Amino acid sequence: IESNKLAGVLYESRNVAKRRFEYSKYRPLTPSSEVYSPIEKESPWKILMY
Amino acid sequence: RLLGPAAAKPMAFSSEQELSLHTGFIENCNGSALVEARSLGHQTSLITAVYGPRSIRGSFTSQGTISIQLKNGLLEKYNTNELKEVSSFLMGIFNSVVNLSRYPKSGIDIFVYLTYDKDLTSQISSLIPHCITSITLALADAGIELVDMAGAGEANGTVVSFIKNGEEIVGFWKDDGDDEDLLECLDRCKEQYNRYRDLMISCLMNQ
Amino acid sequence: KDIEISASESKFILEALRQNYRLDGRSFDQFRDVEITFGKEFGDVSVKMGNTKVHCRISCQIAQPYEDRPFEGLFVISTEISPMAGSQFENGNITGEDEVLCSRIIEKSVRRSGALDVEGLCIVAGSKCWAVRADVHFLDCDGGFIDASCIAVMAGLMHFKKPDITVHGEQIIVHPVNEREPVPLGILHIPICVTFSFFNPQDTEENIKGETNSEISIIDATLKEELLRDGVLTVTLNKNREVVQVSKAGGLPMDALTLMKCCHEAYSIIEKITDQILQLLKEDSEKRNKYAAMLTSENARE
Amino acid sequence: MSLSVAEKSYLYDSLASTPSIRPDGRLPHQFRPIEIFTDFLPSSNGSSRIIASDGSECIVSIKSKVVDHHVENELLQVDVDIAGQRDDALVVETITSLLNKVLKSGSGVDSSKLQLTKKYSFKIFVDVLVISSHSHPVSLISFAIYSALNSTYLPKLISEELPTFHDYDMVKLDINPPLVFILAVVGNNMLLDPAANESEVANNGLIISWSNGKITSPIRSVALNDSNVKSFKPHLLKQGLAMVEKYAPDVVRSLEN
Amino acid sequence: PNLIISNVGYSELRKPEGVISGRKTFGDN
Amino acid sequence: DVAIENNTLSRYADAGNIDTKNNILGSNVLKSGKTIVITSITGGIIEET
Amino acid sequence: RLSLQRANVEILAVEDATFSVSQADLGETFRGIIRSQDVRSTDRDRVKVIECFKPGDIVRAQVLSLGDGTNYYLTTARNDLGVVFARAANGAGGLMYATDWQMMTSPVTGATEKRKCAK
Amino acid sequence: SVQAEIGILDHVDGSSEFVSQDTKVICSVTGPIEPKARQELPTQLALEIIVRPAKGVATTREKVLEDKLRAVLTPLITRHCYPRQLCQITCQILESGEDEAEFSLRELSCCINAAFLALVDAGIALNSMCASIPIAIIKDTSDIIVDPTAEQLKISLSVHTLALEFVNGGKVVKNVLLLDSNGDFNEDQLFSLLELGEQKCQELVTNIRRIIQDNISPRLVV
Amino acid sequence: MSRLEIYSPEGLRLDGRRWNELRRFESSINTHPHAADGSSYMEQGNNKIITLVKGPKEPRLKSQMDTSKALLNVSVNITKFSKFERSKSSHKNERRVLEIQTSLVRMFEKNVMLNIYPRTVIDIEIHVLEQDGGIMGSLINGITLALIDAGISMFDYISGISVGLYDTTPLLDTNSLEENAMSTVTLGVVGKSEKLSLLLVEDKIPLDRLENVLAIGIAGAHRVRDLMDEELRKHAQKRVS
Amino acid sequence: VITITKRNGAFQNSQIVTPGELVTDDPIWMRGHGTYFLDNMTYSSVAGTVSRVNRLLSVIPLKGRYAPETGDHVVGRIAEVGNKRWKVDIGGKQHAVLMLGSVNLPGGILELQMRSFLKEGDLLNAEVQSLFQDGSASLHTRSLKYGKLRNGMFCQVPSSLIVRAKNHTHNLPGNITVVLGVNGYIWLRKTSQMDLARDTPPSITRLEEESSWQIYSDENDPSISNNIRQAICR
Amino acid sequence: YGIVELDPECQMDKLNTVLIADLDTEAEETSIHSTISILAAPSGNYKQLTLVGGGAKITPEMIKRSLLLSRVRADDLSTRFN
Amino acid sequence: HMSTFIFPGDSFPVDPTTPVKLGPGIYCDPNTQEIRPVNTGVLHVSAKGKGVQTAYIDYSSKRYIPSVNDFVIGVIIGTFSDSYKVSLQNFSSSVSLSYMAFPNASKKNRPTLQVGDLVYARVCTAEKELEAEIECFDSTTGRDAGFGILEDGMIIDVNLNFARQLLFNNDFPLLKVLAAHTKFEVAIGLNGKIWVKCEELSNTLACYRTIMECCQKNDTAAFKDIAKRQFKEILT
């Protein structure tokens, strides 16, 4: 409150509380910080080959 | 730089156009030239040096960048404002002749030294056709690519630079003079451009 | 290329000031003891206050007066700082904010404030006059740059002597130094500079709209105290109770009562530094003129 | 300006075609709306402030000084200062040397219209200040000095001794101020008064000076951009040159109003 | 030609042989 | 080796036909090897008291 | 310049043998960078560039990928590539000659210095 | 007899003050320190030599003064043991002791000695020692005299500033660092002063060694 | 003009005003919405100052950039035609101008919340079209009103007022003729407070008189703040509705 | 013909708060943008109107630039090419960053030649992925809808004049497609194959899209209708 | 003039040094760290001498040689064209 | 056992036959291959048969040169990705303090050091052609006591001679005369930095003033009277 950054922390706290769980098959195609899935990579086996 | 005392005052006193062409004789730059013209009561003697092409560190331009600079010599010292005016006109011409797309991420520096400009009786109009013919000889000596030779001529203040045997105009300059003198001034410089064009090739092929 | 200050050192000096402590051991209103060392020729003055050492060189020459003031002489001054006083000064940077603010303060104190008699420096109106030059050499930097430089220039002008000139209508003959004894310059008042450094144990917000003034002000800061300084103030007074010039721009916005207090605290300082320069000049004169008691011509009768 | 090569080819293909489609759709003989303010500096004889459509703003001030014309060569000195650019910059001294030729004492403007006694005469100081610019401002300054010179008032002469001037009355400066126009050629089409994006992809540029209802001497053909620099047919030189002879009287009728 | 060992620093020339404490906390007294 | 040219760029180059508009008092175009040196000399005057 | 993981150089010539002298010192000359991963042919992950090059040594290195934002990418992972001309104590000694693959010695001074030789 | 003091500045690695006759020069040495982009040398140490006059700004007169002083200190410092480093050597002439417009030999002689002293106090690798003296000849007797006063210069025909290099206890002369002369002289007088200048600089380093020992020794194990 | 009465026994100055009266104050906001994000045409008396605020934006080069605050640049350009006699000197690189440019940066870098805008630069461009005494104070009020137009967060107003002392009588808002006949003091008061962010004294003033000059100086500066504040009220109300 | 406006004589033609005044003395509030807390009392740092949304107290300034928020469809041109990141000019207070991993590369996992297909000045459109501590925006081009703009002309409008809607881009009559960005960067181009076919009308673990450099090529469409180009100018 | 110190590694107790007259080219100006520039006048008179001995040791042998080699240089120049 | 004052360029009073281990102040010419002094100071030698002999020159200096196995105090001026950037002395070049050069270092957790923090480390790399490196734990022995952040306190700038005579010479009557007045902890840095810290600020300041006065005064027997007067001055 003295640093006047209280509103910035509470705004980010809302985006954390607004996080939504979704299965990997029905996840959004556009990568978003609001949705989460166990698999968020288009081809997960590509990052294991490299 | 001494300049001496500031209490000192400077002294106050109360058809056919010969041409000379040379090139080289300079080891600092890549290509140089020297043009001299003596006709009626006016003589011209200026030296042109081309320091390039130099690769520019951190540049990412698609084509080259020309840098022309006219420097006052030792006689008939012009004002510095008009020297850079002719330089900007010289860059506007050579940006269409020099193959800029061949030298990416690099620039070309031009140094023309109007060493001895003398009048025996705007005065810079008569010197412009002599500066253009000195840079083309110096740019070709430096291995730089130019699309056809570039020359110019004088017709009472009006200076027009042609290219491709006078088929297309690359630059136009006029100061003082008169009115409605256009087609005659173009043909007076068109035949003068060809006089300077083939003379540059004759000097650049000798040994 | 700049001085690195550790967070531990920055916190210590601030808290020491909150306990009325200075690393060098002075008080919050104690000016550094000044020392004047006169050179060989006239106008060669070396000033040493604390670890800060400065050297001034006074010269003059014949020049053309200004077209708007043909009855006054010129006063030139340039304080170019070399890496000798510290490797943080890049050589050749004559446009530095410290060099700019130093010259403008001394120029206002000497020339504009009427310290040097410019009207007496006029030989022929609108043609020939004296252009006194003050070259200040910063030898060792430890704060108080414009404080010592102002003492050096004022001690230098009072110690310098200009060549004698005899006017024969329109001609001007500069008498050699061996021919006639040079004449000293005329000095009306003695401007002495006193700088003030300010600190706030709070922050900027508690200082803009805060009635409780918790600022800490110190007189003549050192280099380490200067690097941790928040607000800066420079006043210049003379022994005639006159404010020669004041320069306060930026830093902590202070109130009128504290700035007036800075002047009254600085007057007791400039009053003592004035009498020291008058005494050290008197002792240096007797050093050069040892047998001056026998060579007096204007003597009283009976 | 700075654009992408993707849109540079789009504007190049659209301005070189036979319809000659302009970006903003204006005709090759049309101009952009301009605001001009005059007479606002009491300490100066003449003054003018011009504002363009793209945001270019330029201020011109006019001062006077009595000087012996037998020892003073040029009586019309133009001092140009562009904000953000050095006084010794290459782009500043070119316009400074170019405007001194379009307003030369004797050539561009006759000295007889500012003479006083047979010995003394008035010297005109034209101070130019460019607050902002996005293209070549030589054509914008000409419009500013035009309205400034036509709104200038100098003290009246009272009459070999030193001249004396009246206290209240001041005479108007009756001077025909030359005008400067900028033309850009795109392949085979002429464009009068180009824009920041038109002049960036153009092939070459033309500068024409207009004085006393005719094309006067100081003209140039400087390139507007270092990227696309092409040589032009001589038939294009006379096309745009004779094109201003038809629409410049429409400019003066709207500018001298 | 000489019997030359590379120029060594100031610390390796001493006698404690690296059993030196650079930060000594003086407690009490 | 050197090669010089004196009074070549001065107003007094031709002792019979002087230059109409020139200020250089003397010149010397020296060249030693591949270096080129040009030395012109202008003139002034000061009033002493 | 010698960095912990790279070595800044300056391109002086180029071949197609025959060469070509560069620009004559002042800046605006072609420079490159030899990454530590391309110094040797074996054990490309752990190398000591201080034992491979010293400031003022002529190194023959082949260029690689042209990410010429400012420098070039070079390599010395061969036998004919490496230090071809150097001097003891960074020019303060005698002219050294490449003996082994990573050992350079000057005959007169007799001193040895570890380089990335090319023989 | 000349005076000299070492270690007078608090914000430089090495400081010095050389006083001879009336000329006084204070020098300041700082290094090795981080150089700039255009200053760093790949193999050896870089030098930033700067001399300043007593009056006025640094004109072109002091520029040749820097270039001559630079040639004296460059071979004297072991530059190769400080790669990619800088050393600032600033010489401030407090009193000229001569005529600045007509002469510039006494200031060069004091800047050389003051710079060498400040290089010793700063702890920079020096291959040897240095000593510089001014030499002129009076047109009357035409004989060689060292450290001529200000009045003796105006009557001199030729001036000289000899800088030498001494090794092995300040006795063996390794090489002649600088001998700058201007005026009227011949070959017979050249060695007539070069032999006399070698024995006047030998007693100078012997006097310098005594000075730089009375101040460094108390600061060490004492 | 000529030999005028500076302060007659009738309390009237050479221009008609009295000891505590100010010149006419006509400020203008958002005069260059096409050349800068902040704009203020200051017309305090005969003075006519154009102030532009370009920013906060990325610096043209990544060399100078503070990752914890902003960079505040002030460019004061005194035109040649600022006075009656056209200036022959350069004025731009003048040492007196660099002192003013620096004094303005220090004055506002403490008042402008540079922390709110990190890794940015705020360029302030000033052009003086005409001057007539008290030019320093009018430079202050122009920057204040120009930053507000740019939407830059500030702690309070910064007011510029000039006060002269003629014998034993202070004079508010000194013109050119008054500055050439007495000592001048320019103040930089913060809002309705008595905190001074600027105090320039360039001529000799008795110590026994400086305190009263400062009090009458800050009092007139508050009056300058209201005239700027009332200008923003009228500009904001007519813009919304 | 020219239309010149002339003048003579002069140089030219809720709760409103000013910086430095007191807005409230109630500590039970959340200090927002354009507001600084001090001594349990709230003051305004800019000039504008007071906004009271929930307990968030903020001041809306008059002249306000573009504020980058998470999930904004913007248009910007590349300002410079850095080490694996490209600073793009969106129009805010700083340059938005575009990491190399935020765009679709045709090569993929298989090369510091970034300037080959995306140099300085190139115009494109993307979406704001997140924000930094200082307020800088981070964009991404992980969608086929976001690509390098071409076949049109660029223009700029004030940021406070763009209304936020569902579809960021719209198809207009005359075979013209408009791209409205909240930053104020509009792109008027002819309708392409993408904006025409989309804007108007258990053993699956997803797959990776194969996108070539066909959308990064500077080569514009060869034949653009003359009747269409005159519509873009209109 | 210049005093160059050789080396046995380029075609050995001690060595021999040679004197080079009129330095030129980037090769000589960079490597040679010991030069002698002098102004020679007729009748065996000298006007200016600079003796820098940074590189090799300047023996009195090469001092007398540079002086005599300059007297002939001043005689040819003064009698080159006039 | 010989100690005499020498000068740069003087003869070296050591026979070439004897094996020698030179150190600071003595240089080996890469051409003449001879041994010559390059510093002005006392020449120290020690002939021992067990059978190696060493020689070095103790000269007065204030600019610190990074040398291996040195205890230095630095200020953190930059935080890179894989290391820190520390400043051992103003104007001098920077040194590298890697994140892995800490007790219990790991790739997962970074050190809790921020800019402006005083660190105490050991110089592990001092190559002339490379950037110097430091570490908060002796990578040769495993020691780590005393190394780390020096929270609060006050740092002191002294010459290099005063630092070595305080760390190695146990007979230097400074820590003994200071402990007789107040309890404190000191951190001796060979780069001319002496970090002190007491319970009260009045005692820490008194330690700052004594070390400063004892640094310029060469009389060692006067350290008792300096602290006697200095600790008496803070009582007012």
Author numbering:
A (entry chain J): 381 to 430
B (entry chain F): 8 to 21, 42 to 148, 163 to 248
C (entry chain A): 3 to 304
D (entry chain E): 1 to 159, 167 to 264
E (entry chain L): 90 to 118
F (entry chain C): 51 to 99
G (entry chain I): 145 to 160, 186 to 193, 196 to 290
H (entry chain D): 2 to 223
Provide excerpts from the study:
The crystal structure of Exo12Dis3exo-endo-/Rrp6exo-/Mpp6Min was determined to a resolution of 3.3 Å using a synthetic RNA with two 3’ ends. Electron densities for Mpp6 residues 90 to 118 were evident on the surface of Rrp40. Mpp6 residues Leu92, Ile93 and Ile94 reside in the first beta strand and are nestled into a hydrophobic surface of the Rrp40 NTD. The most prominent electron density observed for Mpp6 corresponds to Arg112 within the last beta strand. Arg112 projects into a pocket formed between the S1 and KH domains of Rrp40 and resides in one of two regions of Mpp6 previously identified as conserved from yeast to man. RNA binding activities likely contribute, however alignment of Exo12Dis3exo-endo-/Rrp6exo-/Mpp6Min with Exo11Dis3exo-endo-/Rrp6exo- reveals changes in the orientation of the Rrp6 catalytic module (CAT) relative to Exo9 with Rrp6 CAT tilted by 15 degrees to a more open configuration in the complex containing Mpp6.
The eukaryotic RNA exosome is a conserved and essential multisubunit complex that carries out diverse functions in RNA metabolism, ranging from normal turnover, processing and maturation, to quality control. Subunit composition of RNA exosomes varies according to cellular localization, where Exo9 and Dis3 form the cytoplasmic exosome (Exo10Dis3), and Exo9, Dis3, and Rrp6 constitute the nuclear exosome (Exo11Dis3/Rrp6). The nuclear exosome is associated with the protein cofactors Mpp6 and Rrp47, whose individual deletion in vivo results in misprocessing of nuclear exosome substrates, while concomitant loss leads to synthetic lethality.
